[PDB]
RNA sequence: GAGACCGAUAGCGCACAAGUAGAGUGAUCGAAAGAUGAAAAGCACUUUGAAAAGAGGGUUAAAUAGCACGUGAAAUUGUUGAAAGGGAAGCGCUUGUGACCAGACUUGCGCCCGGCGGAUCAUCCGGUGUUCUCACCGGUGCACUCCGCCGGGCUCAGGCCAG
RNA sequence: GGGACCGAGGACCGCGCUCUGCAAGGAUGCUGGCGUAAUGGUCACCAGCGACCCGUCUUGAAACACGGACCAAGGAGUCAA
RNA sequence: UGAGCCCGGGUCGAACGGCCUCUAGUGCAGAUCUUGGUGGUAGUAGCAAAU
């Protein structure tokens, strides 16, 4: 569609080979679920977003261009509540000039 | 009659009371200097008091009460603008608040010091609220998590997603998908579907 | 200093707490302590062996009673207005929104008890955060 | 945190109920317990056997001493009676969740009874009184492995 | 100070408990050889150099015969033994230079990406390379001098069958 | 027409088929039993089979609200899981093993330098309300003063447990 | 000289002393450790030691005697003169 | 200390709570307690009566 495509540009001549990074929310507890979603897309790092509790809390605005230097294609953030996945948000980072693109949340359920 | 009100408020009924079981009493009231309920600190019972007030748009007051304009409420509390430096607003506490109770005296400069310190604190969490760019948005509706727990037990059995998978699986393999000499089939089974 | 205000060591004499006699054997005996009346109840007897009784002995300190393990006290907030009146009082109490406390109101009085300096006990119970 | 095991996809799982059936509890209770994790031909052909009074089944829990054979060498049991009712009614609940699965797509063959539970009914209000029974029983296939490829150096 | 103070916290009582400088064991004179207890160098044979403050030890191998460098140990968790290595030649200076405390106490793209990362183990300071290595030099050589003092040092105190410390005398 | 009454084991025996059902030769005796949902929209149709029963599928905000119908406790029972069990269990003090669950200090202020913007800063001007000397608006600018903000540098401060 | 347990109180005040401050009306100083878990809870079980089934009634006392299959709801010093 | 009280998670659908006073048909383990429901006995006795 053309109206889809001049929206989104980025989205839909190929796309480059995927790179991920996974982090969660700020302070943490589902790291091995984390890790299994890391496990789910190729080529695919885990990094705890936090490091310790009265640590530095970082931003995802700051994550996204860290990975976007640091040749990344894409960031995924598995927000928490009552120590299980709740909120899956993607956020393409694309390449060159482009800015940061869509940033997609879900909900996960069960 | 000071201390005849003071007997009604503390032993018969206050309506800025709240009781609670942990062994202190606090006052409701906007117009006293510590929240508890005492002798000291009640607006009400003392014709002579200060309090110190921040207005939404900043501004730190200090607030008297005079015995003369009591009959008055409307006109109960005289208010003076408190010195933005912390130091000339501490001495502007002590020529008001002259010849007062010392008590007063201790607890407008301790209301005076906690009103400007929240406003600091107020400032640093807005600056790392505005860089984080995290809000707490309200968890779901107990009638929205029944609506959707409902129709995704019904979707599942919709989906039948295993059946799914298998007819999708085997219509790539018919149009040749996997091309000539597939790598997901072994060889005899391709023989079978020509 | 961003924390509790300074208090003695918390000491609990016990931490047990005094179930009632026979409420073991008995489904229709509730864990309330009852006093036991009877002349010859071995619980009444203070015979060894058996259950204790509540004293005041074991009574705890009183500048650490109601105290919580982090030190502060308690207190049931149920509206924004509850939370400024700990404005004098963010090291000795806490705020614990209380059960019937609607969702939005949560979030308004979560955002004044972090401005205020206040502790909350209960912070993520019908909330949750958005990027 | 721990999660819960999950159930069986409904792709893979037939079910069938059976609620206030006029059968004595504890006799449905016995019969269930021996035919649970089976195959559904072997359980077919095992209830049709103690109808035939040739196969019996194992009274634990609910066991009156009615009778000791040599139908009890098969399970270790000393205690074996012969409920034709119970098989009867069992038999008409696998063949109703056959029934189930073929309708679904399921392969017959492979059915075993991951699941059955019975429970008791409302007593019937006529001094005498009856042991109704509620009887749920769910189908699944058994498990296919398939193989996994070699992993590639990269 | 800056603050008014805001609430009733209230000072404490002046207490009258002065520090008043510790006196070691006879047995913990410099050159004394001790048996290291705990640590990652447990049952390790070392020389004392100096006796530093609040129960600490300063401690040196010397490194190029065990292989324990410059370190402080706890006086409570050394057996002192009988055997006392002359101290003559080794640069007094040098040893007043180390017992200073200084000497052994000391969010970007960068920050971000080492997060849960085992930080690489540092490499050995050049500073306290050169300055082992002026210690250990004459310390060395008045240790060779003794015979089989050099393997005793290089050696590792153990426990045997019978042997009952209680009697022991080290 | 009312109530500091009771709220379906209560209140008249009866909130409903109640002097009904039913018992006794008869005089007489005399119960139990309320609540789908906002609206029947009370499950069409496919499919097992003999039924007050299922599997799909649908209605509804919700059917684990399906005329067994609001909520749905305990006794008692089935399945699954964990541990134990040599002629009692249960209980008190104190560990230990395993399983599941929770998450410890809210984790900060003060100095210095440079820039920028504000004012409670100018014996600046106009206006409003007032307790008549205090507040609040509007327009001026930055000589001074004071607040913030941004970019550096620096300081101390802290919760618990050990030696 | 060696070991154990304990640190109550919270500006100054008092008695003193070896008086440029001290051990003199109650613990400070230094160093380290702690967030994919420091530390707790509940359950199940094992282990050492302990430990008669409650109420009523008789009697100096035990011992008899009466009540207790289990759960929910009701249930007994009230109102007038 | 205790009688008890507050919070979290689930369920659930329309009203309820703290303070200070007033009021009472106001707190249960027993009464071979009352009404209801449900056990072991027991798939036992035995097929008598009732259904
Ligand atoms: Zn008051």
Known sequence: PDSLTSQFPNLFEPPPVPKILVTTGINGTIHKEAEEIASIFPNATYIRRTAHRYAYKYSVREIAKFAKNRGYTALLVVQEDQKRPSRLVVVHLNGEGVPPGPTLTYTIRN | SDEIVWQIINQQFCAFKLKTTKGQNFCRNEYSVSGLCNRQSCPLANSRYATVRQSPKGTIYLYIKTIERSHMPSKWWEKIKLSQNYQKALEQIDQRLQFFPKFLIHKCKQRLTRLVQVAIRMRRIAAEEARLGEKLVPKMAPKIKKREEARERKALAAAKLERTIERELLDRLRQGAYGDQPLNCNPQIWKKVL | MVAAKKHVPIVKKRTKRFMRHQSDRFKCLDSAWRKPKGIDNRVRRRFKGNLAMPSIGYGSNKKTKHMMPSGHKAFLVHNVKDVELLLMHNRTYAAEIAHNVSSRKRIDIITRAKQLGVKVTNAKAKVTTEV | VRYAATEIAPTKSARARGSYLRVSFKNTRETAQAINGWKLQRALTFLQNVIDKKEAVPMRRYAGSTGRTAQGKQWGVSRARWPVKSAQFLIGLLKNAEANADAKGLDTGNLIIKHIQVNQAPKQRRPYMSNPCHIELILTEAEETVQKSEAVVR | ?170
Not at chain 5, 89 to 107: M, R
Not at chain 5, 113 to 130: D, I, L
């Open chain 5, 1 to 170: 100070q800056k603050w008014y103070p805001a609430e009733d916290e209230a000072q404490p009582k002046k207490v009258r408990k002065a520090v008043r400088p510790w006196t070691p064991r006879k047995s913990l004179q410099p050159g004394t050889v001790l048996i290291l207890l705990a640590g990652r160098f447990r049952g390790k044979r070392v020389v004392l150099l100096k006796c530093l403050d609040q129960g600490v030890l300063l401690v040196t191998g010397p490194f190029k015969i065990n292989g324990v460098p410059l370190r402080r140990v706890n006086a409570r968790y050394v057996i002192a033994t009988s055997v006392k290595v002359d101290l003559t030649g080794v640069d007094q200076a040098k040893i007043d230079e180390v017992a200073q405390p200084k000497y052994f106490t000391a969010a970007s793209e960068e920050a971000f990406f080492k997060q849960g990362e085992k930080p690489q183990k540092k490499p050995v300071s050049s500073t306290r390379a050169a300055d082992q290595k002026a210690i250990d030099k004459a310390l060395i050589a008045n240790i060779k001098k003794v015979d089989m003092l050099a393997s005793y040092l290089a050696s590792s105190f153990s426990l045997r069958k019978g042997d009952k410390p209680h009697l022991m005398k080290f």
